């Protein structure tokens, strides 16, 4: 019969596949946690000595 109702089939959490970053270089880097109070007093810079 003529004049049937139509709607939208939207699958609201069936995402199509999507891109990523592997992060591999920064996952392999050495990590360091300086003290946040010290970094504030220092103005977000710190220094380390070199050998003689």
């Amino acid at each position: 019969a003529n004049q049937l109702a139509k709607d939208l089939e939207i699958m609201f959490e069936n995402y199509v596949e999507g891109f990523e970053a592997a992060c591999v270089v920064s996952r392999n880097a050495k990590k360091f946690r300086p003290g946040d109070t010290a970094m504030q007093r220092a103005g977000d810079v710190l220094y380390r000595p070199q050998h003689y």
Partner: protein, 364 residues
């Protein structure tokens, strides 16, 4: 995708507009085969038997041919090589297949998801000809020599496809992009229907381009889809429709620092075209494509029409070798003295992520 913002105080910065992009997947018009037998012809039962056999396999083979044509036309990563006059054929194809995966990796397609390659019989032979002629005649070398089979290649599982898609012979004209086209991203249009963000439209200085072309624009390079850092490789665009100087292409030209702020998170490329930027058509010669994908982008969706049993015709179903439903219907008109036979199937083929797919063409 989201913008990055700099500093502690953000009171001057616009928040990233969320854009709920949707991609359509749609059934084609139904695919059918019709034949008829009269009441004299039906005295020999081989005609129904052989025509039914022929109809069933011809619809199965069309699902494959439609999908192969679809993937060949939509795939956005494209690499070309001339056929080698030296011994380097097959090595140059391995370098091209690995170049597709290197490009997929550089744009940010996941590295851990499974990968498939479908080689036309000539370029599958070119790979087997390299691997079979290695100086240690054992194992994979000996299989490649004796039976022309190859193991996986360049991180792809390797398949030989008897049918393959062909790119056209590209134009010899010095085409250029007119204006500086720069597409926006939208969730839905002015009628409130979802917008397909995989396609956009450009103007070109003369009507030389063809459906299925692959081309690059002089100043335009792909970016990593998350960080938006340049790959340093040209972005390839696929022609999907033509109308004089107006051409529909895939993907959209979405720059980093797009004039539309809301689409900047969705950038594909490092810049928009310069004024009068040159078009380089990659498919200089017509050639059979070799198809590559990372899994989850390329799909067949299957339907079934509601053909009723027990009224009028007699109706039956079968399954193709790809899992598609066939409906077989037979109806006899006793005034005409004829049986009409209908074989029918309903499906759609789609490439949900044109970046998860690529093609290699040899012969330049």
């Amino acid at each position: 995708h989201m913008n990055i913002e700099e500093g502690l105080d953000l009171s001057s910065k616009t928040p990233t507009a969320l854009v709920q992009r949707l991609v359509p997947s749609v059934f084609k018009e139904p695919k059918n085969i019709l034949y008829t037998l009269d009441a004299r012809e039906m005295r020999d039962p081989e005609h129904k038997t052989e025509a039914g056999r022929a109809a069933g396999m011809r619809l199965a083979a069309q699902i494959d041919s439609d999908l192969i044509s679809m993937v060949t036309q939509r795939a956005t990563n494209v690499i070309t090589m001339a056929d080698s006059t030296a011994g380097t054929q097959g090595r140059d194809l391995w370098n091209c297949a690995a170049g597709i995966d290197a490009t997929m990796t550089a744009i940010g397609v996941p590295q851990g998801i499974n990968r498939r390659s479908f080689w036309n019989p000539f370029n599958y032979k070119d790979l087997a000809g390299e691997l079979g002629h290695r100086a240690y005649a054992q194992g994979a070398t000996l299989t490649a020599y004796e039976k022309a089979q190859i193991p996986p290649v360049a991180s792809f599982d390797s398949y030989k496809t008897d049918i393959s898609g062909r790119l056209p012979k590209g134009s010899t004209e010095s085409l250029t992009v007119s204006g500086q086209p720069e597409h926006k991203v939208e969730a839905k249009d002015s009628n409130g229907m979802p917008v397909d963000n995989r396609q956009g439209t450009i103007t070109v200085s003369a009507s030389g381009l063809q459906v299925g072309d692959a081309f690059t624009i002089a100043g335009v390079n792909s970016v990593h889809q998350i960080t938006k850092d340049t790959t340093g490789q040209p972005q390839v665009f696929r022609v999907l429709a033509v109308s004089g100087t107006t051409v529909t292409i895939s993907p959209k030209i979405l720059p980093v620092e797009n004039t539309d702020v809301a689409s900047r998170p969705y950038a594909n490329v490092d810049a928009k075209p310069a004024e009068s930027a040159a078009i380089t058509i990659l498919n200089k010669n017509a050639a059979p494509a070799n198809l590559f994908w990372a899994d989850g982008s390329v799909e067949l969706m299957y339907g079934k029409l509601a053909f009723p049993t027990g009224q009028g015709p007699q109706v039956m179903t079968a399954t193709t070798e790809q899992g598609a439903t066939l409906i077989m219907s037979y109806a006899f008109d006793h005034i005409k003295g004829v049986t009409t036979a209908r074989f029918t199937t309903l499906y759609g083929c789609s490439v949900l992520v044109p970046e998860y797919t690529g093609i290699v063409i040899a012969g330049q």
